[PDB]
Amino acid sequence: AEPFAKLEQDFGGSIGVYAMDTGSGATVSYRAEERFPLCSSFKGFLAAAVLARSQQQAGLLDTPIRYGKNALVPWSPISEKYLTTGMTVAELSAAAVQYSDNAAANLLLKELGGPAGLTAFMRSIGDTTFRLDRWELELNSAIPSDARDTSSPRAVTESLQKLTLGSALAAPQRQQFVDWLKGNTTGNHRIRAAVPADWAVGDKTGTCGVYGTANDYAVVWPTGRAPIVLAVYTRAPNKDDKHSEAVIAAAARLALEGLGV
Amino acid sequence: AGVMTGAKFTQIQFGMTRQQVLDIAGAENCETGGSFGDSIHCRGHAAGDYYAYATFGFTSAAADAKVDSKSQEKLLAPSAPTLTLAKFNQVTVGMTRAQVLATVGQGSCTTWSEYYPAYPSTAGVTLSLSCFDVDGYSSRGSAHLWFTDGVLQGKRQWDLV
Known part of the structure; x- marks a missing residue:
């Protein structure tokens, strides 16, 4: 734990980590039960909830969604491009996961019944810590001690495990979720930076950008070895405090060392 | 490069x-x-x-x-962001680009999106402006103004003060 304490003090805030080796059952835990803002990392679970609903509602993923300029929000690289043609639910899901597309995320939340709809899905798979209260972009406020739009590193990791390696999703949907995470383009400098370039990694990042608040969670497949699931979240006391991708990568390395990886 | x-x-x-x-x-x-x-x-x-x-x-x-x-x-910064929730509320559908700029400030806007469906003709051109207030262009407090054929079709904002 000492190395974590040192890392977070160098950073000037708080760091929460939870990692599990799915081969040995071993874990590493640092502030793993404290709340941290989800930021964009909620989009990963958003995609899973879409996939879960598609098991109940046939043809859901192939439904073309038409939207206009009124639905765009800042940081929507994919949905902005398909404004004239629309996008399917599956395409919106991939954009939210892989490019943190904001307009796509709000469109999907709409399909699920909003923030309470996503929260209800998370409850349904056994996650009682997760809470989404607001939409993009309001959910990114990251105000210290505000419990809105937060979860904990442990709950994040436990849910991630159930969804990617467990039975929370049916096999075809589970594989789609995994494939989407593997294709993420936003996390090259975080957890992915802590592992060999030839190890398969699926991840979702989040960056509120205020209060030094940022994060990443991942499933990592070490060649020949059983997968590791981990979440690294950061938080800092002052609005103008900067987040650090380097700190997240360093925390990931520490957690992996702790697992004997 | x-x-x-x-x-x-x-x-x-x-x-x-x-x-x-x-x-x-x-x-x-x-x-x-x-x-x-x-x-x-x-x-x-x-x-x-x-x-x-x-x-x-x-x-x-x-x-x-x-x-x-x-x-x-x-990729582009605003020249002189002066947008406020006041001016934003002054912007009305139907305004030309010039009218909108006068309202929000001629230094407040960057071009988010610019599309010619009939290229090389400019007929039907669609334009998205991203407009920022005081500090809005940082990493907070901005607007989206969209036009077709140079006429404002709509507007949306986030955390304007």
């Missing part, structure tokens, strides 16, 4: 070929296919939970198609 930048964005012109776009941006910053279909998407430095970027649309999937669409986030 560096990362994608505003200077590169500006230097890239409507009517150009994919090859020219790549020449200027540096193919290493750029991708195509996948989620971007036949468009070319180029990344600059980290920003938001993504990267500053440009996206270039082409008249067709064909090899000699031309740029008919230019989009960017965080």
Whole structure:
């Protein structure tokens, strides 16, 4: 734990980590039960909830969604491009996961019944810590001690495990979720930076950008070895405090060392 | 050749070929296919939970198609942001570009999106402006103003004060 304490003090805030080796059952835990803002990392679970609903509602993923300029929000690289043609639910899901597309995320939340709809899905798979209260972009406020739009590193990791390696999703949907995470383009400098370039990694990042608040969670497949699931979240006391991708990568390395990886 | 930048964005012109776009941006910053279909998407430095970027649309999937669409986030800064929830509430549907700029400030806006469905003709041109207040262009407090044929179709804002 000492190395974590040192890392977070160098950073000037708080760091929460939870990692599990799915081969040995071993874990590493640092502030793993404290709340941290989800930021964009909620989009990963958003995609899973879409996939879960598609098991109940046939043809859901192939439904073309038409939207206009009124639905765009800042940081929507994919949905902005398909404004004239629309996008399917599956395409919106991939954009939210892989490019943190904001307009796509709000469109999907709409399909699920909003923030309470996503929260209800998370409850349904056994996650009682997760809470989404607001939409993009309001959910990114990251105000210290505000419990809105937060979860904990442990709950994040436990849910991630159930969804990617467990039975929370049916096999075809589970594989789609995994494939989407593997294709993420936003996390090259975080957890992915802590592992060999030839190890398969699926991840979702989040960056509120205020209060030094940022994060990443991942499933990592070490060649020949059983997968590791981990979440690294950061938080800092002052609005103008900067987040650090380097700190997240360093925390990931520490957690992996702790697992004997 | 560096990362994608505003200077590169500006230097890239409507009517150009994919090859020219790549020449200027540096193919290493750029991708195509996948989620971007036949468009070319180029990344600059980290920003938001993504990267500053440009996206270039082409008249067709064909090899000699031309740029008919230019989009960017965080590659161009506003010259003099003065937007407020007051002025924003003064902007009304039907205004011309000039009318809108007078209202929000002629230094407050950057071009988010610019698309010519009938390229090289400008008929039906659609325009998205991203407009910022005091500090809005930082990493907070901005607006989206969209036009068709130079007439304002709508507006939306986030955390204007």
